[PDB]
């Protein structure tokens, strides 16, 4: 297939980037390609052609159609990845940066190049060592308010020799993990906390995916001003779960917790040690089915000294909560709220916005979560 005179030293890479995920609305990096020994390739009269490729909406593997799943890794049993070129479409004819569109979310982009001899006989397109994943999370003007975002599928593991590789699909938690706030695209967003991640092959989809498994430990994010309005949107996996999935420590005296019970009930627990609110337990008007994935979103906003929290399960409102911020002589200053994930939970993805998402935005995220591993 390949002409005998194409040299073996073609070098293909992404220029000036160490980040291999991008959101819709961003522009990706330029590609770069060339023969290492240019004296040799000129003497053979070889030139190059290059192109960007976008992976298809599904992968054709083992005579079936598999849903694409993200990874930031560079095999045997494990993740199913698109093959170049059968699972890609060529989208450009050069190395110039690609403007990432909404229609590219949840796909791979890869840059490839080939040698061509002076008779016009082409070699095979060759990619560099690293593909780009286009984040599945819808943007549509939301990205200026995305403050935290972690997709468990993008977690990696750090080996003894400090190299970083994919987590093996062995169904057990690993704690030597590389997990980040991916919304942070300028500075280091890798979390310093211990975040156990499980990679496993999910039979429902004949494909791997990953789950954060905190096993009742907590991860804490501080200094969130809930007066701006705030929204936490989570996707949890299809296993039985219990405990404090999400806790808002609005104050040293005021906290509000989404607590899962094993029977699928969602308890809403309020603690206020001031006289501003009583506190106690309420139950959301829902029962989770832990044999499916479920999305849980909480949006909060302050209007006229009242903090309203609304809970959306799989897109549906199932609980509204009002908390007095100024009552009976107390004033709760919630400019430095804490957002805590925890419980014996299995978290596939979470996103935090420093605004109250509209009804439309809540539905957009609920549909993304519901279709993340579904046929597209």
Author numbering: 83 to 156, 161 to 462
Give excerpts from the publication:
Type 4 pili (T4P)—important in bacterial pathogens—are filaments composed of one well-characterized major pilin, and several minor pilins whose roles are often poorly understood. Streptococcus sanguinis T4P are composed of five pilins, which makes it a good model to determine the role of each pilin subunit in detail. PilE1/PilE2 are the major pilins forming the backbone of the filament, while the three minor pilins (PilA, PilB, and PilC) form a tip-located complex promoting adhesion to various host receptors. Here, we characterize PilA and PilC, showing how they interact and how they function.
Protein crystals for PilCSK36 were produced in 0.2 µL sitting drop with a 1:1 protein to mother liquor (0.2 M MgCl26H2O, 20% w/v PEG 3350). Data were collected at the Diamond beamline i04, and structure was produced using the PilC structure from strain 2908 for molecular replacement. After collecting a complete dataset, we solved a 1.60 Å resolution structure. Surprisingly, although the purified protein contained the pilin moiety, this portion was missing in the crystals. It must therefore have been degraded during prolonged incubation in the crystallization trays due to its inherent instability. When we compared our two PilC structures, we found that they are essentially identical, superposing onto each other with an rmsd of only 0.79 Å. This suggests that these proteins—showing 57% sequence identity —are likely to bind similar glycan ligands. We observed a similar binding profile for PilCSK36, showing that glycan-binding ability is conserved in PilC orthologs.
